[model samples]
Target: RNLRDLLAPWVPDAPSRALREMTLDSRVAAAGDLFVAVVGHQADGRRYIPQAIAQGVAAIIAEAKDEATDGEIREMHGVPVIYLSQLNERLSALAGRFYHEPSDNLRLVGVTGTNGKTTTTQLLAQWSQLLGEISAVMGTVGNGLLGKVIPGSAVDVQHELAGLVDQGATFCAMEVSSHGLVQHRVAALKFAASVFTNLSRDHLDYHGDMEHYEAAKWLLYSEHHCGQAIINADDEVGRRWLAKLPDAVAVSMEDHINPNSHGRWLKATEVNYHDSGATIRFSSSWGDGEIESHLMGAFNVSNLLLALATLLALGYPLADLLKTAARLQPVSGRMEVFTAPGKPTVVVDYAHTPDALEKALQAARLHCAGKLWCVFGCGGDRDKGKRPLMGAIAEEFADVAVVTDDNPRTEEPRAIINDILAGMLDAGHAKVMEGRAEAVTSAVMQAKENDVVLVAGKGHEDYQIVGNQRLDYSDRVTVARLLGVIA
Candidate 1:
């Protein structure tokens, strides 16, 4: 808890002073504390060391310029400085040490990939909790337990994991993102297990290309303390990584992993989709089992299997897991099946990208007896390149695509809708609307009893950002209110 203890894990050299606390913030850097100067793409933490010293930091860890001595530490304005080599690449392991390996204090499972991570992590928490262990989650939607997550801020990532440990959680499923990984936001933690849902085209908004994107994601695999890796062998990227890591738990909905050739594996033999959900029959190294889930789509099969493989790796009995598997509920905004006890099935999801929206629609189509309706829109001012792509995806996937306002963020709402409409073969099939509340309601009301409707994008988010303002908004509220269900 003191400088000596914190530095013992990261700083092996005896030349620098110790710290009472660890921080990346220049404002929070104080005497008796250590500051890490990380080099960022847009801004470098190395440039802030002077400001951090001005605040009286005890020791500084700056980015190193070469080998033999990747880090250089010197007294600056009477404060000790330590430089670290390959700072970006080593941040996770370094932070893991600084936090006393909080991940080791509890069972940690990291869910990665372009999609299904949030849903898979939810299943991880839900299943673990049902088996009598306290569990928590960290990811796209938010962090913490099923019904409790105080969201916001990037630094909250490590603090949230630490809070879960402090709260006596035996297990935690953290959503590891490429953005988070590339930025070294979670560089300081260890993982008991890590999972890959699948990879797709996303975050080109920031990463700029697919190969660089893959490298960012690979950081969790190649670097961090991911004790066990649960992967989706059906994905091209998954099969490729499997050759590199033979001990990984390979899971697949397709027959990508050969039962005779794999390490520990779980694969679905068959999946029966219905308006209600799915009845899945899967074969695993532990044993084969048939289970029912109230979540729609083929993606859930992959997500479900990922969690099942994770639980098995953690030493849970396969038979005992089946008993708990039946109780794993769908995540809100991530395939949440909302029906008024006996009504048309309506799902809300956080599928934002073109590929994500396509998958969600196709999955919904499998369970829809009537027209498959998709209500969604891209975030304003983020990435305009994907607008037409998403439009085309919706055109080919959904029976009807209701394009509505989704956080226009100061852009003209109609202009965003027009861009999305551009990708469709028949833009008339896409209903352009400004009121998201009305869009969600109309889609639900128009659906027949057997139809499936997915309100995609914005999962767990409670507000709508327009221009510079964030206003209170929730799809669940609109669906519940429109159906006359009072909570």
Candidate 2:
């Protein structure tokens, strides 16, 4: 695709000239290519215009508002320059036009929330794939088909979505972050449906307050793409958004449905929690159905409903979902049930928040014929408030709480552990451990049959954060080794 032809409407002041490709990063700009100067929170792209020109670029498109050079779309080395009309707000559209609107070529579903965005989006892609269609996923873990995730960088965002297109993926479930939204990193892409898993304390370091945090999140479901909205009404924040987005699919397993709101709803009428899983009976505008999942917790139930509603909104018959629901495998590291033939049941989850931990423990309690044990910890150097908060979760939900190290980056691990212990009464009931592997090993090895052990905090993370160094580690690996899966 010729750059001048591809960027037809936004072509430089000069008449049509043959060009190569488009790029946002200066390092990737080749000869005869357009280097778009996207504004970033940490660095300004306009500062790199000289570098882009040094590497030989055909044209430039700098954000008008903050360009140090005053949005001048002139020649640096005989290369044409163009200025974005309203750089921040119109970013998503600009990327769409440049990428030739890839989202339009596939069924796109955007999943948002502080937690479970990765898990919920993974389920959407997985469930849809289980029903027999070319499916792909994009989220925190990575982006690509279910089996092949190429991780890291926003460049992968465009490349992965376009890669899905090339590989014959007809539908994709994507995870959109608040940072990704406010920065316009993923603004260009559109969606067929958007799902909200509950939101809680997160991203405060960047947003500064809840109001700013929510405003960033709402931008996706409201401003950028008004795709079909599937929301977890059980969440306080989701319920409030329900009023604003009246057309959203209101999903709740907690009997928090509102008939007065727009009729698109799927609420659990009843639930039966067993030692292994739960059976949820629900009624929706589409129809009523009862489904059983090997997944644990109310959060998982809400995640399942969000996936179901996304399917409904995308035109997949809800009856088909009911019939095929059992075949969909539970997401790896997301409430994964590890049973060694006849050994104790070990559940692994990606729950990283205080509320998420509480739900995980409470959910495990329902499945434990014996005692429910929670072995979890807090990361260091960040969010000190949540350390004690998570301690409170273990105290309230688990029979025995084992406090240990998560990712004590730069901060002393002992200090983080102490804060967690402060949140609990009778600290003697809780075990103190240091190494994450040893902590997981101790919990799993000692847990008796019919006991449910939940390994929290690390969830999907495969490494431990100690100081600024990230050591390769995995709770799943520790569990599997303890159970003799790997030598």
Candidate 3:
């Protein structure tokens, strides 16, 4: 690709320098490569212009804010240095152009909100794959074709999607985070459908308030080329957004959908929760059918329904979806259940927040014929407010609360445990365990055959950060071992 050709839409008079690759890092910028220097929240990329030049970069596209005028071209070591205003905002478009607009070629579904993004996106990918389209997923877990996700920037996002397209993926489900949306990481991707799982109190420190967080999420529909909208009507924010997005498909497990509305809707008529999973009987605008979900919890039911509604809106036949519904597996670590003969059922989940902990416990209670035990702990040096709140939830929802270590990075392990105990009505009633493995083992070993144990905080994560070192640890593995089952 030539520099002039790449920047033709913005810089008409740009020099024609053959470029090999595009990068944001100067250290990786090699000869024939275009190094993009943008002003970020933490650091100025322009400071690395000299370094990128030293590395023999072909051209440099930099942020013009307070440095130079937009579209200004200057010479740096015989290499063309072009400047553009609001370069961060324009990065997605630039990468999209460079990557040949991969999203346009693929059926991309973007899932957004405070929770269920990972599970919802996974379900979308899995369901689509079951329906015959080669599917992929991008988000927290990683980004790649289904079962190949290893683990990016706006540039990385576009680049990864292009790679997936090259690998023969016809459909992709992406998890769009609030930060990613605000940073314009996915601004250029053409979405086949946009899904709003739900919104709650989260990332308040970054967004400063719920309004800003909600607005950041709204950017997916309002600012981008979101083709179809599928929203969860059970959420207050989702309901409000549905009122605005009249053409959106409304999905609900909590009876929030109104059939009288002219818009398309899917609602759960009856849900039978059991030890193995749930049997969801739903009626949608497309048709009515029953889904035997392998995933647990009311929320997983909601996530599965959101995926169903999104795919239905995309024109997949309801009968076909119903046929494959029984095959839909649970997302790893998101309310993933493990069991062994004559052993207590243990559920490992990524429920770190107060609301998530409450929900996880409530969901676990539905399957527990005996006592319900919750073994959880807060992470060190992050969200001190949520520690006690989580403790309070466990105390209220579970038969027993086991407070243990999550990731005591730098902070004293006992100090974090104390904080969690502060929220409990009777701190003495809860078991104070130091090691996470010990907590999980004790709960699993001591619980009755019919009891259910929830190992929360570190779901799907395979490491425990103690101070600066990351130790090999996994709640799923520990619980599975204790229950004499495979993770």
Candidate 4:
């Protein structure tokens, strides 16, 4: 690719130079590569321009907010340096251009919100793949073609999508995070659809407040090419957004949809939650059908419905969707279940937050014939408030609460446990174990065959950070091994 052609949209008279690659890091910038230097919230990228130049980069694009004027071009070491104001905001566009607009090549679906992003995106990819399109997913778990998600910046996002496109993926489901949105990580992707699962209290430290967090999420629809909008009407914030985006598909399992509104909508008429999964009978704008979901919980039902509504809006036949509904598997570490004959059912979930913990327990309770046990702990050196909140939720929702270690990091394990116990009405009623593995073993060993154990937090993670060292560990592996089953 020619440098002039790449920057023609912003720099028409830009010098022509063959570009081999595009990068944001100076260390990796090589000859014939376009090095982008943006003034990030942290370190300034312009500081590395000299390094990038020294590394024989073909050209440099630096932030000009406080330096040169926008579109200003300069010469250094015989290499062209183009400056652009608000470079951070425009980075995604540049990356998209460099990546040949990869998102446009695939039916990209972006799922955003406080929770359910992973599950929703995974479901989208799974359902799309089942419907015949080669699909992929990009989010917390990783980014790759369906069943191949191995693991971005905005440039990394476009680059990965480009790889997926090269892999012949016809559809991609991406989890859009609040930080990603605010940072313009996916600002330039052409989404075939955008889904709002729900919103709750989270990321307040970075966002400062709920309003900012919600506004950051709103940017996906307001600022980007959000082709079709699908929202969860059950969420208060989502309902408010739906009022503004009347053309968006409203999906609800909680009767939040109003059929009289004369708008596109999908709602669950009835749901039967059993030990295996759920039987969801839904009525949508496309048609009415029953879904035999292999996922557990009311939230999973909502996540599945959101995915259904998304695909329906994208023109997937309702009949085909219902036919493939039973095959939709659960996302790793997000309410993943494990069981063995004559043993208690164990669910491994990444329910670190108060709301998520409560939802996980409630979901597990639906399938438990006997006691529902919760084995959870909070991440240290983070939010101290949520620890007690999660503790309170576990105490209220589960028959028994087992507090254990969850990435103690630098914080003392016992101190974190004490903080959790502070929220419980009867601290002594909860079992306190320092070793996470021991805690999980104790709960699973003590529980009867009819009981259900929920091992929450660090769901898909295979490592535990005790202090500075990361010890290899996995909740799914522990529970599955205890149950004499594969994870």
Candidate 5:
């Protein structure tokens, strides 16, 4: 890649320089590589320019500060140097161009919101693949086609899409987070459809408040080129957005869809949550159908409907979509239910936040014929406000609450536990077990038949962060061993 050709639209007089690889990290800079120096919250790329120059980089594109003029070109250490204003916002676009605009080659669908992003994206990928499409996914769990997943990065967003294209993927479903949106990580992506699952109080530590968090999500519809908008009518935030985007397809399981609504819509007419799972009957512009879902919870019903609506909007036949619906399995760590011959139904989920914890309990309650048990803990050094809220939810919803350490990080385990108990009125009644394994074992060993166990926080995660150590720990493995499923 040549600097002049890459900067043709931005800078006319830009000098020609052969660029082999583009990198943001100066530590990884090499000869013939373009070093992008941008300012970040945690670290500044501009601080490493000398290192990049010393490493023999071919060119440098530093983010223009307020004082620096945009498109200012200069020479540094015998290498071409250019500064562009707001480089953080422009990183995705630059990466996109460098990756050859990979999103354009695939039917990319982006699922956004506070909850259900992972599950929804996985559903989209799985369902699309069932219909003879080579599908892939990029989200919290990671990025890969189908079952194989690799840990993702900001630049990897564009790079992976390019790789998926190279792997012959026809469809890709990505989970777009609020942090990713505000930071412009996926800003350069071209989405075939963007889904709004639901918005609740989350990430207050980063965004500061709910308003900024919602605004960050608003960028998907307002700022980005989100081809077709599929939103949940049940969510208050989604409903408000629906008023603004009248053409957006509305997906609902809470009877939010109006029969007289003019636009394309999908609404669940009936949902029967059972031990086996849920049987949902729904109607839409495409037609009406029933889905015998193996997935648990009301939120999952919404997630499934959003995926169904997105595919319908993309012109996938409703009959074929319904045929694949029954086969759409539950995402790992998301309402993933496990039951022995006569044991309590144990659900392992990534319900770290208050909304997620509450939803997970409600979902598990549908199948619980006896007392409901909740075993969860908040992460260390995160939004402390939600700890008690989660505690309160567990107290009110579940018959038993087993408070344990999730990821203590550098914080004291008891301190984090105290924060969780603070939100509960009857904290004395809640079971406090600092040891996670003991806590899980106590819950499982104590519970009677027909009871349901909801293990939250570190769902699919297999390691626990205690101080600086990542000790091996998994709820699934613990539950499996307790139930004699594994040695």
Candidate 6:
């Protein structure tokens, strides 16, 4: 691609030069590469322009403040430096152009919200692939087609989608994070559909407050051209957004859908939560059908329903979708179940927030004929406000609360446990097991066959962060080993 062609849509008077590649990092900038300099949270990209030029960058694009002074081309160290106002916001579009508008080449759907983004995206990819399309996913778990996923980044988002397209992938479901939305990480891609799972207290340290966090989530609908919005009407934010978005699809487990008041809608007519998973009978604009989901939790049912609504809205045949619904496997680390004969049922999930923890416990309670045991801990150095909230969830929902360490980066593990304990009414009654593996062992070993043990906080993660080091730790592995079952 040439510089002139790449900037033709946004910049008219752009230089005509061959562009080999595009990058935001100056350290990796190479010959014939386009270096985009924008003001970031940590440092300004403009400061690294000298190094980029030294590394043989052919052209430089710097973010400018105002339109009047921005989008100008200047010679810097025998290389061209082009400035565009609000470059951070335009990074997605720019990346899209250089990547040949990869989203257009493939059927791409974006899943957004505080929780369930990872699982929802995964389900979409898996379901789509089962429908005979080569599918891929991009999210917190990483990015890849179906099973093989590599860790992803801001640039990795667009680049990997393009690679998936090149690999002959017909459908892709991507997780659009609140951080990704605010930073313009996916500002320019065209989505076939956008799904809102639900919203709750998360990333408060970065977003500052719940309102700003909600606004950041709102940007997916308001700022970007997210096509066929599938929102969770059960959520308060989702309900309010439904009023504003008449064209979007409203999905709910409750009787939230007003048949006379809205546009398109989907709701569960009947739901049966069992030991294995759930059997949901849903009614929607397209049609009414029953889904046998292997995934656990009511929250996951909401996630499944959202994915169902999205695929339906996208014009996939209802019968085909229903036929493949049973094949949709549970996402790793998002309510992954490990069980053995004559052993207590153990569920490992990524429930880091109060809402998530509560839902996970409630899900486990359904199968637990005896006690419901909760093994969880708060992550240190982030979101202290949610610590007590999670504690309250553990105390209120579970029969046994095992407070243990989760990451505990830079903070004392005991101190973090204290924060969690402070929220519980009967703090002294809760098990104070500092060692995570021992905590998991105790919960699994003590609980009878009728009891259910929930290993929460670190679901899919294989490592724990302590003071800056990532220590190898896996709840699934621990539970599997304790139960004499292979993970």
Model 4's TM-score against the true structure = 0.81
Model 1: pairs clashing at backbone N, Cα or C within 3 Å: 3-19, 71-83, 72-83, 73-81, 92-187, 95-188, 96-188, 333-349, 409-467, 410-467
Angstrom error of the Cα, residue 112, model 2: value is: 2.0
Residue ranges of candidate 3 with Cα displaced over 4 Å:
10-14, 41-50, 64-77, 83-86, 199-220, 340-343, 350-356, 375-393, 401-449, 457-485
lDDT (Cα) of model 3? 0.89
Off-target runs (Cα >4 Å) in candidate 6 are 10-15, 39-51, 63-78, 83-85, 152-156, 199-223, 339-343, 350-359, 375-396, 400-449, 456-486
Q: lDDT tens digits, residues 310-418, model 3?
A: 9999999998999999989878777888878899888888999988888889999988889999998888988799988998999999999999999999999999999
For 214-332, candidate 2 gives per-residue lDDT tens digits of 77666644566647878888888788888887778898888788897656988888878665677889899998998877777776777888898879878898777888877666677
Residue range 82-180, candidate 4, lDDT tens digits = 999988889899999998999889899998887788888989999999999999988886888888879458888888889999999999999988778
**lDDT tens digits, residue span 1-487, model 6:** 8888888987887888887778888888999999888787767888898999999988988977642266687887788888888877777788888889999999999988777787789889989888889999877767788888886235657788889999888999988887777777887788999998875654565635867766766764577778898988888778888888889999999889988874999899988876567899999899899998888877788889999999999999999999999888888777877768899989999889999899889888876778999999989998799988999999999999999999999998999999999998999989989789988888899999888899998887888898999999898888889989898
Which candidate has the highest lDDT of all?
3
Question: How many residue pairs collide in each prediction?
Answer: 10, 3, 0, 2, 0, 0
- lDDT for position 9 in model 1: 52
For each candidate, the alpha-carbon lDDT, in order, equals 0.78, 0.77, 0.89, 0.88, 0.86, 0.85
Task: Kindly provide the TM-score of model 5 when superposed on the true structure, using C-alpha atoms.
Answer: 0.77
* TM-score of candidate 2 relative to the true fold: 0.77
Q: In model 1, where is the ten-residue run with the lowest total lDDT?
A: 150-159
**Alpha-carbon deviation at 2 in model 3, angstroms:** 2.7
lDDT of 5 by residue, 1-487 (tens): 7888888878788998899888888889899999999888767788888899999999999988953689999887798889999888788888788778899899999888877788899999999999999999988768888988887345668878889999889999999987787678888789899888875554565635766766766654577878999988888777777877778999887788765658899999998876657899989888998998989988788888899999999989998988888888888777887778877778888889888788889889988889999999888977799989999999999999999999989999999999999999999999999899999999999999888888898767899999899999899899989987751
